[PDB]
Each structure stands twice: as C-alpha cells, then as structure tokens.
Amino acid sequence: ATSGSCKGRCFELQEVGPPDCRCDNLCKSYSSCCHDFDELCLKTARGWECTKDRCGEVRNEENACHCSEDCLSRGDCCTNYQVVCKGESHWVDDDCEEIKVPECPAGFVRPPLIIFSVDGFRASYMKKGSKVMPNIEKLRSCGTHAPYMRPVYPTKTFPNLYTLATGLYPESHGIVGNSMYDPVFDASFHLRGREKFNHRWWGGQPLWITATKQGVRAGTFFWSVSIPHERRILTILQWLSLPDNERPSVYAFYSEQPDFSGHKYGPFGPEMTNPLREIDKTVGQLMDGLKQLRLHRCVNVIFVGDHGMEDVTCDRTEFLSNYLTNVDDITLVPGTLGRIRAKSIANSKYDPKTIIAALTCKKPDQHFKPYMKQHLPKRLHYANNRRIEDIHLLVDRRWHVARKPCFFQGDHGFDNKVNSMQTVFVGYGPTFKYRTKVPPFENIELYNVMCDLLGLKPAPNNGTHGSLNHLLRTNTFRPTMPDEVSRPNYPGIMYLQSEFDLGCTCDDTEERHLLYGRPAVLYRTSYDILYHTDFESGYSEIFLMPLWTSYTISKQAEVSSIPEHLTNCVRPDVRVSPGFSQNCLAYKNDKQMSYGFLFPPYLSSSPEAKYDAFLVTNMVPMYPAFKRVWAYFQRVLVKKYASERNGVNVISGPIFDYNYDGLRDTEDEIKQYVEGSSIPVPTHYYSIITSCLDFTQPADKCDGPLSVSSFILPHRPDNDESCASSEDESKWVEELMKMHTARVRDIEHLTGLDFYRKTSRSYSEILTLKTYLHTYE
Ligand SMILES: O=C(CCN1CCN(C(=O)OCc2cc(Cl)cc(Cl)c2)CC1)c1ccc2[nH]c(=O)oc2c1
Ligand SMILES: *[C@@H]1O[C@H](CO)[C@@H](O[C@@H]2O[C@H](CO)[C@@H](O)[C@H](O)[C@H]2NC(C)=O)[C@H](O)[C@H]1NC(C)=O
Ligand SMILES: [Ca+2]
Ligand SMILES: [Cl-]
Ligand SMILES: [Zn+2]
Ligand SMILES: [Zn+2]
C-alpha cells in the first residue's frame, strides 16, 4: 500500500519503496507511480521546440519544456532555446575541433558517460543514411568509430541489451532470448507480460549495479515505452543539471526505432528514411542540449545498437509440418531461430533422436539446420543454460521457421556472424580518440570500456580487458599477461624401444616453428616439450596427447602422400614413458574409433623427417567420420593457406568440453574414453592459423602486426551437419570449418592455454588479435 504525489519528484534517481509511491522512469512498468505522475511529469504542451514568439517567456508550468529567461537556471529549457532565442548555432553546424581534455564546468570531477542505444540499428545505416543523419554523422566522423560491432547470438533485443550492460554471453547472464522457459521456475519469460520484471531471470552484474556498489551514482538504464524520446533526453539533461552530490556519472537513452519500422517495412524501405531522421533529430537535441549546458566538450557519448535487420517475408518460411509427422506434439520458439521442446502431457513416445533425424538434410535447398545445442558452433556460446532447449534449429538468413501454416517485411535473430545482423558503435568525447576508425569488435567487450570511462573495477565478464585500449585517448587499463602455473619438462632420450609393448608396428626448430613463444599452461598439470625437425609439441602426461602442436609451413612447402609401408605406422617416443603413452591395441579393439595426427605427415620436410610424424606422442583419437575432415584440412587446406598468406604458422590440438560450458574440462569432467583405456576422446579439435598482416613478408620472418584465422571443429561420430558429406571432401569440408570459425580467445578458455607471449607487439594489440573472428562475409 502506497500514498503521496510527484510534486518536485519527477524522474527521481533513488528507487523509493513503500509506504511512499514511486516517481522514477520505470514506475509505469511496475504500475507503481503516484496518482498524478502523468499530469506532473509527462507534460507535452506546446511541443518540444522554442519558436521566436516563445522567446523572453513568462513561465507556464503546463509546458513540456520552457523558453523563459529562468529556464537555464532550473535546467529545463527546450534543447533549441539558445539557438532560436540567443543566436547560438546548432551543434551539427559547428566544425569539429579536437577534445584533448574534458572541458567541463565547475563541480564535474570526471567526464560523464551517456550510452545512446538504438534498437535494430543495422551497421550499413551509417553510410547509407549519412545525408539524412547529419548529427550522427558528425559523432561518427569526428569521434572514434568502427565499421561495425558484432552482437551476441541470438541477435535479439533482450539478450543483446543485457549483454551490453553486463559484458556476458546470454548463456551466462540468463536472458537467452526474447522468449524463454525455465524448467526450475516452471514459468515463461515474454515480451508481453509481467514475468520479465522479476529479477530472478536477470543474472550477472549490470553496469549500473557495478557503479553504485563502487560508490558511483548511476540508476537503471531501462525506460518505460510510454515516455517519449524528447522527455527521455530532457530528463537526462535535467539530471546533468542536478547538484554535485546528486548528479549521476552514467546515463542511458533507448530508442525503439529503427527496429519497430524495420519489422514492418524491411531494413531499407522508402518508409525507413523518416525513422532515421527522427533518431538523428533526437541526437541533435542531446548535443544542442549538452552545448546549452556547456557539456558538449565534457561528456563521453557512446552511440551503440543491439543488432541489425534482415529482409524477411512470409513467403520465405519453412514449415516443420513438412518434415515431422506429429508437429502438434512439440513446442517451438519460431522465427529467425528455432528452439524445440516436447509437450508434457500424454506424449511418452517423444524422442529427440527422431526429431533431429527427421529434420536433417531432407530438402535439397533446406533453409535451416538442426543441432543439439552442444554441437552448435562454439563461437555462438549458446549452450550452458537450462533455459536453452536441447534441440536448436539454426535458420538461414532471410528465412523463417514455423510449425505449420504479410504482417512484416524485416526481422532479426539469425547467426551473429551475418552481415545484416551487424550493428554500430561510435565513441565521441575527451576520453575517446578524434577522427579515428577502429577495427570491428564484439559487443561483449564494451562493458569493460564503460567501466574504464567511469573508473570502475569491472565485475567478472566475457570481455578481454585491454583489447579495446586503441579506442581510448586516456584512462586505459594496463593489461597484465597471466602468469604460467605449470612449468614444462624437457625430457631427453630416456627409454629403449623394447620397453614399449603398445601393440604398435612400423618398418623403420624453435625459431622456425614456435614463432610467438610457447603457449603458457594456466592450470596445474604435468607436460613435456617435444622438439622435432618440422614441429614442436607440448605433450600432456595426464591426457596422453599434445595440448598444442606448433608448426610453420612456408609459401613453397611440399605436399606429399603417406607411403604404403607407413600406412599403419605408429612409432614409440623414446623421450616419453610407456605408462604415459597411447597404445595401438585400444584403437584395434575400439570399432567406432580410429586415430589421426596433429602434425600432418603430408607436410614433412623429407622422407627421413616424415618418421617423426608417426610418433605415438603425435597421434590423437579421431572418429573415421571426423578423420575425413581433418585429413582434407591437413592434406589440401593448410598448404592452400600457406600459399595465399605467404606462409602460415599452425597451432593444433584437442579440446575437452563435455559439460558444454565453454571452459576447459577437469580430468573428472571427461565423459568418454577410447575402449578399455585411459586415452580420453576430445569433444573438439582446434587450429590457430597465424601469419604476417604484411603479405610481402614471410610468416617466420615477420615484423609488424600479425594476421590470424582459427576454428574449433566439433569431434563427431558422423558428418550429419554437412549435407554434402556423401561427396568428395573438397565440396563440403571447408564450408564446415567456416561455420565453426573461432577466436584465439575462445580456444584459450577451452584449453587453459595462453598464446602470443613472445612477440614484438604491444600486449593490447595482442589482446585485440586474440578477440578477432574471421567471419568469411
Ligand atoms: O518492446 C520492446 C522493448 C522492450 N523494452 C526493452 C528494454 N528497455 C530499455 O529501455 O532498454 C534500455 C537498456 C537496457 C540495457 Cl540492459 C542496456 C542498454 Cl544499453 C539499454 C525498455 C523497453 C521490443 C523491442 C524490440 C523488439 N523486437 C522484437 O522482435 O520484439 C521486440 C520488442
Ligand atoms: C563468461 O564469464 C562468466 C563470468 O566470469 C563465466 O561465468 C561464471 O563461471 C563460473 C564457473 O562456472 C561461476 O563460478 C560463475 O558463477 C559464473 N557466472 C557468473 C555470472 O559469474 C563464464 O564461465 C564465462 N564463459 C566463458 C565461455 O568464458
Ligand atoms: Ca567444460
Ligand atoms: Cl527468442
Ligand atoms: Zn532489438
Ligand atoms: Zn525487433
């Protein structure tokens, strides 16, 4: 039960509990405002602009904003008041001048951060909308900007907005979609409903909580949709005109446009010009309002978006009624992505194996692919959450998925790799750089950058702190390279060949191959460094295989066959013991399992050096199905990349992620082994393919920035993911690798390793290199 009024309390910062009634920006969404909130706090009279007649006004309380002589004192002028009355120019009409320091008025200790989020703002609107968006174009052109910013999967509103606030993946922070079902709560998250306002859904620590816990005044970023954009801007300016001990440091504006129009008219419709003009007008109001308060050279403005917008029509819609016999007996989260769940009551004959088999490669031009969430590409980071359904359908761009058979011309939620889903970033202000383009980056990196701008120690998150230091002029975070916990052994020749009874038979460096220093193991283990002519290895003495195998292949390297006499060759390693070696007898007895090699025998320097490739310490357990993919990569693709990139350095190895949390498994978490043995079966295999950005310099004699592409290939007993897998490997293998492309940082979480420790590059640039994703778009 509550009582009171919002006289002199409109848009209060402190969230007031009972017995007082609320007057903050979210009070309408909880149905908790005082009786007279709409009359006092949401006035619209005489619009949002001063005219000449209004100048030199007598104050009228009914007005939305004022043009009186005493408006500047109270801090509630209309944004154009000084332009129309006092003869100032609009901010957009001023020529750009570099902001070396925070040019702030008295009382402002640190530059405030204003986060200007825009819903569904596609990356290519910056160039395409330039002429109708002059204010935005001044921020982009004269501030710091990227060509695009990558969202998180699924590319939807609530997962991305809360990812911008937390720096976490949707699997971690809990908002895995715009719709969700939690089996533990036995309740449903929806866009239309009161359930979304409950805090139990919202994990992690959002930026505004991170501020207030560290003494910095912030307040919640969420606005009620009923509040018009001009009232949101005016309120933000009103908060900036509060006294020193009441004024917030961080501010958030939100625009539902261009998303709302984008769904109806498509991303580039003729009706889409006005939405973009209004968004620019809203920015021009902010900058004119900031210039009016002398904060246009003081504030840092981040202009960011949650996701893009793709052309999606009701004609391009795939129906699961065409594939499944009993489509009425399953729940689907439909549209630009698919999540399948079983109906609870009277449906004991439900089977996820039957559903995935029934949806796998049935139409030739099939516009979606079924995955178990564990088999989804690791770049998506969409698995480790009970709210994420086991069955997932990854929908093709431009298409929809539904159960059974327009209102919309556009949509979003596809793979975050897709061009149309890419969104925007512009930093403008004293702490940002001037007229500086930067490489595109992931939205998970932004939380750290906002914390640096506010002087906050960020809560644990999925950004890589330091990777966006090149965006900022000052206030950078000094990134410390993580300390290596396990030092390597360097074993000499300690074992005779007759000591090995492995059931195996066969008729029988550092500067060249380890270019960036050795990887550092950041967990407590026991491993050996093995040197060879063509490759170096960090051989795990617990997992009985390399953690990494490093090798460089020059532009003019030889690709050769495996001879007939070395077809089933496996040599013992005289540096590593019989007890810490794999055995061939396990592979003979395991019918479903075979073996492969991390360093390819195909790329050996000579017939003499080739025998090093068949060492037992180089072999790894591979399913025959996967062995087709790995062998083609090794035989054809590695040489291809070396030829194209003027040599390449490859770092290959296993990954164990049976609990699908994106982290390296401990020995206890490994859920499968080779038959009758301690040889563990990896869930994935990685390769980090590094070369010189300057293509004129070779890979092994490179100075200047490095270039990299990597992947995390799933280790599968079949090739059901690749519909062309019946055909020759050149028609499908490289397409699979492209879908499972990864960052070096993704591999580091999954392996507990740390790469690029000895280079001639700054560590901030190396962290930027580790966060890079090669998208093939
Ligand atoms: O109805 C909505 C919006 C619902 N709310 C979103 C959150 N919100 C807000 O102000 O975000 C503020 C904010 C919060 C955070 Cl964590 C971080 C930042 Cl940087 C900013 C209030 C409105 C909507 C929008 C797009 C949609 N596309 C679709 O298919 O359905 C849709 C529904
Ligand atoms: C992304 O980062 C988050 C936060 O560091 C990680 O989630 C935490 O993981 C640990 C270990 O499982 C738990 O103790 C925490 O409770 C988790 N959540 C939070 C909110 O702190 C997550 O593992 C990271 N993911 C990846 C792929 O690196
Ligand atoms: Ca794991
Ligand atoms: Cl969703
Ligand atoms: Zn959105
Ligand atoms: Zn939308």
XYZ file of C-alpha atoms in Angstrom, residues 209 228 323 359 387-388 459 597 665 706:
10
model
C 24.886 -2.057 -10.220
C 8.521 9.850 -25.468
C 9.210 -32.677 -42.064
C 14.857 -32.541 -39.901
C 16.622 -22.141 -20.353
C 18.315 -23.083 -23.696
C 32.773 -7.493 -12.467
C 47.844 -36.868 -36.326
C 37.255 -29.738 -18.585
C 50.015 -10.365 -37.163
